[PDB]
Amino acid sequence: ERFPADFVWGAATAAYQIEGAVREDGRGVSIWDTFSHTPGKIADGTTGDVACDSYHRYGEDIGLLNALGMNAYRFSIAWPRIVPLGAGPINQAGLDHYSRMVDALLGAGLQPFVTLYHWDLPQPLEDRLGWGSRATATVFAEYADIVVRQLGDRVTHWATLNEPWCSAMLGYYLGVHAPGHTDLKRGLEASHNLLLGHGLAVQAMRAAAPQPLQIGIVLNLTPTYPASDSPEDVAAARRFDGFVNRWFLDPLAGRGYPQDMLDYYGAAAPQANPEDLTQIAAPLDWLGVNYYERMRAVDAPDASLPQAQRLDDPDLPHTADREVYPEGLYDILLRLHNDYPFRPLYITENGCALHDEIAEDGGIHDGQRQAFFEAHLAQLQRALAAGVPLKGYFAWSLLDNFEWAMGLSMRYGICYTNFETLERRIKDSGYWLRDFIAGQ
Ligand code: NA
Numbered sequence: 244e245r246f247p248a249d250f251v252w253g254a255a256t257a258a259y260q261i262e263g264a265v266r267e268d269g270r271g272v273s274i275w276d277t278f279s280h281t282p283g284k285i286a287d288g289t290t291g292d293v294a295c296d297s298y299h300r301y302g303e304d305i306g307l308l309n310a311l312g313m314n315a316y317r318f319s320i321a322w323p324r325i326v327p328l329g330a331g332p333i334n335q336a337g338l339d340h341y342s343r344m345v346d347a348l349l350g351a352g353l354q355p356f357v358t359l360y361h362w363d364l365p366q367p368l369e370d371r372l373g374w375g376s377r378a379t380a381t382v383f384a385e386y387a388d389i390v391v392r393q394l395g396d397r398v399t400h401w402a403t404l405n406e407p408w409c410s411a412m413l414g415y416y417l418g419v420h421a422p423g424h425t426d427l428k429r430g431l432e433a434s435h436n437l438l439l440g441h442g443l444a445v446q447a448m449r450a451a452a453p454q455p456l457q458i459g460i461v462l463n464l465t466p467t468y469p470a471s472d473s474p475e476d477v478a479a480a481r482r483f484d485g486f487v488n489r490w491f492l493d494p495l496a497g498r499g500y501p502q503d504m505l506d507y508y509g510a511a512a513p514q515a516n517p518e519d520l521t522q523i524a525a526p527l528d529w530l531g532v533n534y535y536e537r538m539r540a541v542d543a544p545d546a547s548l549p550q551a552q553r554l555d556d557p558d559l560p561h562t563a564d565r566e567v568y569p570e571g572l573y574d575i576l577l578r579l580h581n582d583y584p585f586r587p588l589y590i591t592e593n594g595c596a597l598h599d600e601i602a603e604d605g606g607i608h609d610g611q612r613q614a615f616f617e618a619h620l621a622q623l624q625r626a627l628a629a630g631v632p633l634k635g636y637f638a639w640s641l642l643d644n645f646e647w648a649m650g651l652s653m654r655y656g657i658c659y660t661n662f663e664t665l666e667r668r669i670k671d672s673g674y675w676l677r678d679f680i681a682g683q
Pocket of ligand 1: 560561562563
């Protein structure tokens with residue numbers, strides 16, 4: 244029934260998804276400014292130019308967090324605000340903004356869980372191959388150093404990257420996220436350079452820190468299950484599990500890249516010397532899990548790599564964009580706790596998108612999202628029972644926002660955002676979370 248009295252309860256956002264104010268106060272151009280302004284890349288014609296206006300309105304966001312009774316806020320710092328040219332001088336006005344925001348959070352009793360990199364690569368870097376260039380790793384670590392120097396007196400818990408799989412594979416292989424490239428080799432190169440940047444940044448942060456820090460990385464993980472026990476389907480499940488999960492988990496754990504996936508990728512695989520792998524494995528203080536869905540895999544020998552497709556299950560519920568499978572959160576956590584070295588663990592995202600509307604009464608009756616939280620929280624109790632060292636949970640998202648290639652059309656908030664007026668209102672699932680956390 245009850246979580247630890249010191250458990251972290253929060254909600255999560257990312258800078259480009261919420262801030263707006265894309266040209267204000269020296270901010271540079273990010274890959275997502277370029278990509279969202281390219282016709283056809285975003286489903287609904289929208290951009291992050293305004294989004295939730297949280298650059299100006301983070302006080303309102305704090306108001307929501309307070310009303311929900313949370314004790315933490317997971318948000319990202321926009322590299323474009325800090326180092327507008329990507330490699331170059333700092334923009335002190337960017338640092339001061341986040342300093343005030345940090346102070347406002349602490350004043351409110353909300354612990355800042357800061358993500359350094361949530362996908363907003365400065366475009367000048369991308370002009371020099373972006374994550375396809377080792378140099379971008381080096382300058383990422385420089386950025387991480389500067390931010391920690393200024394804010395590490397107040398912020399203890401930091402994450403280097405969010406969802407490197409997405410940045411590499413959706414940004415550089417599948418083309419659906421910024422910058423929009425479509426080549427496997429560049430995706431895999433990008434994955435390496437992200438991981439290297441991570442590891443360089445960890446070391447840089449520890450040296451720059453004015454106090455000891457709790458440094459992590461945030462990974463999306465997708466528990467994968469073969470649709471049958473055939474050798475074809477099991478192999479398909481392994482390939483998909485390697486493509487999403489083990490590709491990142493293994494090097495981080497100091498186990499190198501998984502050899503099965505190296506063989507599979509062939510000459511598309513990256514150049515990975517021992518020195519880089521050592522740096523990638525820089526010791527972490529925690530690992531963040533972003534959990535949404537499972538993959539029930541059938542072999543798909545004509546599909547692109549990894550040649551594994553989802554077998555739909557019409558007896559499971561679906562949201563606006565995903566299949567719901569709460570058990571997968573228990574499975575993936577039990578696997579981390581027993582099979583990998585990372586500890587403690589945080590759930591740094593979990594949530595769902597629905598076709599939310601304000602009803603005649605003025606509330607948002609998003610029962611399926613309440614049920615989603617209740618079912619996943621129950622699985623976290625099961626994981627805790629099994630000994631998994633879980634220390635906190637962040638709902639994705641605090642508020643509806645710019646959901647990447649889906650635009651503002653795909654609503655993940657526990658709070659509803661009216662994108663015309665910028666008014667926010669707590670959804671019924673948000674009130675549920677409030678009352679559940681208060682009970683805890
Ligand atoms: Na549905």
